[PDB]
Enzyme design. Structure first.
Site, short mmCIF file in Angstrom:
data_model
loop_
_atom_site.label_atom_id
_atom_site.label_comp_id
_atom_site.label_asym_id
_atom_site.label_seq_id
_atom_site.Cartn_x
_atom_site.Cartn_y
_atom_site.Cartn_z
CG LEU A 80 -1.88 -1.20 1.40
CD1 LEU A 80 -2.54 -1.14 2.77
CD2 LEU A 80 -2.93 -1.34 0.29
CG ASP A 105 -1.52 17.02 9.39
OD1 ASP A 105 -2.00 18.09 8.94
OD2 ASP A 105 -1.18 16.08 8.63
C1 LIG Z 1 -2.59 7.80 17.58
C2 LIG Z 1 -1.64 8.98 17.32
C3 LIG Z 1 -2.42 10.18 16.75
C4 LIG Z 1 -1.05 9.40 18.67
C5 LIG Z 1 -0.53 8.61 16.31
C6 LIG Z 1 -0.63 7.66 15.39
C7 LIG Z 1 0.52 7.69 14.73
N1 LIG Z 1 0.88 6.90 13.72
C8 LIG Z 1 0.02 6.32 12.86
O1 LIG Z 1 -1.21 6.46 12.88
N2 LIG Z 1 0.66 5.58 11.96
C9 LIG Z 1 0.06 4.91 10.99
C10 LIG Z 1 0.16 3.52 10.97
C11 LIG Z 1 -0.42 2.80 9.93
C12 LIG Z 1 -1.09 3.48 8.90
N3 LIG Z 1 -1.63 2.82 7.88
C13 LIG Z 1 -2.70 2.03 8.04
N4 LIG Z 1 -3.10 1.51 9.23
C14 LIG Z 1 -4.24 0.69 9.26
N5 LIG Z 1 -4.95 0.43 8.06
C15 LIG Z 1 -4.53 0.95 6.90
C16 LIG Z 1 -5.23 0.69 5.73
C17 LIG Z 1 -4.79 1.25 4.53
C18 LIG Z 1 -3.66 2.06 4.50
C19 LIG Z 1 -2.95 2.33 5.66
C20 LIG Z 1 -3.40 1.77 6.86
C21 LIG Z 1 -1.17 4.87 8.91
C22 LIG Z 1 -0.58 5.58 9.95
N6 LIG Z 1 1.32 8.64 15.24
C23 LIG Z 1 2.56 8.97 14.84
C24 LIG Z 1 3.56 9.30 15.77
C25 LIG Z 1 4.84 9.66 15.34
C26 LIG Z 1 5.15 9.68 13.97
C27 LIG Z 1 4.17 9.34 13.03
N7 LIG Z 1 4.45 9.35 11.73
C28 LIG Z 1 2.88 8.99 13.47
N8 LIG Z 1 0.66 9.20 16.20
#
Ligand SMILES: CC(C)(C)c1cc(NC(=O)Nc2ccc(Nc3ncnc4ccccc34)cc2)n(-c2cccc(N)c2)n1
EC number: 2.7.10.2
Length: 261
Positions: free
Chosen positions: A17, A130
């Site tokens: 993906l 964001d």
């Molecule tokens: C909770 C909070 C706001 C504290 C948070 C959450 C995250 N990180 C994510 O959320 N990461 C994430 C993990 C997996 C997918 N993809 C997917 N995950 C699941 N299904 C999908 C079906 C299709 C496509 C994709 C995905 C997307 C985003 N944080 C964070 C902290 C530090 C650095 C960065 N960069 C982020 N902080």
């Protein structure tokens, strides 16, 4: 080293993906039975401890309406594993095949849930910075979870943030309101016709978006309270949730299913 760790024979990287900037995102299976989302680090395209900052937050932050951190693999190649969401991000979901059929009931509900998440974030004394449709994940039965995909989003950003770096939960409430338009317009980039700089002077001169086509008026009023100049007049997420959960009983009990909402 900790309880989150699993072997890489458990991980079945199946469908890709998209290639992120410092790695790839993968749809797959953990323990041959659990549909899972896997995030990759391209070794030495970033500090390891930077890439694992993600999981360190996702460990701290747990709530039904947030992304679930499932498991880590913290030795090159490094893999972060999180619950799979069948519908991917909200923005896609809106301006895709399904957008056709969504009405206010389904939309305000999605919005209710987001607030719910973002409310837990309030109780956590954490800021998002964001929040916006690109950062929401959808799954089965219109479940919505707050996330951050790692993706200059000024259009969604409160002026105290975009201008003076003053990032608060109240600046997240500004985003929510914008998001409320994304939901009411089925994906359409806010402030159509406007280039960034233009937007920025404009909301400083007090301009706000009109109520969009066929969206009730009490939804717009709500939006506007998110877009109050003074950061502290804006509603609490606790408020917003409640407001939206009670919407068709307490505010539009006279709501009639429209052409587009
Ligand atoms: C909770 C909070 C706001 C504290 C948070 C959450 C995250 N990180 C994510 O959320 N990461 C994430 C993990 C997996 C997918 N993809 C997917 N995950 C699941 N299904 C999908 C079906 C299709 C496509 C994709 C995905 C997307 C985003 N944080 C964070 C902290 C530090 C650095 C960065 N960069 C982020 N902080």
């Amino acid at each position: 080293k900790d309880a989150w760790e699993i072997p890489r024979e458990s991980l079945r990287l199946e469908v890709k993906l998209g290639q992120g900037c410092f790695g790839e995102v993968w749809m797959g299976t953990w323990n041959g039975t659990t549909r899972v989302a896997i995030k990759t680090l391209k070794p030495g395209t970033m500090s390891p401890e930077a890439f694992l900052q993600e999981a360190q937050v996702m460990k701290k932050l747990r709530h039904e309406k947030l992304v679930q951190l499932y498991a880590v693999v913290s030795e090159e190649p490094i893999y972060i594993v999180t619950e799979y969401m069948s519908k991917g991000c909200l923005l896609d979901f809106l301006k895709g095949e399904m957008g056709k059929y969504l009405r206010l009931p389904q939309l305000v509900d999605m919005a209710a849930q987001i607030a719910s998440g973002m409310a837990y974030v309030e109780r956590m004394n954490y800021v998002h910075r964001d929040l916006r449709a690109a950062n929401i994940l959808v799954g089965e039965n219109l479940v919505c979870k707050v996330a951050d995909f790692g993706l200059f989003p000024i259009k969604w950003t409160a002026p105290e943030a975009a201008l003076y770096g003053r990032f608060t939960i109240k600046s997240d409430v500004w985003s929510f309101g914008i998001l409320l338009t994304e939901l009411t317009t089925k994906g359409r980039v806010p402030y159509p016709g406007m280039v960034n700089r233009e937007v920025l002077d404009q909301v400083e001169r007090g301009y706000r978006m009109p109520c969009p086509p066929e969206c009730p008026e009490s939804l717009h009023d709500l939006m506007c309270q998110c877009w109050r100049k003074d950061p502290e007049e804006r509603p609490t997420f606790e408020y917003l949730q409640a407001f939206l959960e009670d919407y068709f009983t307490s505010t539009e009990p006279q709501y009639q299913p429209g052409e587009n909402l």
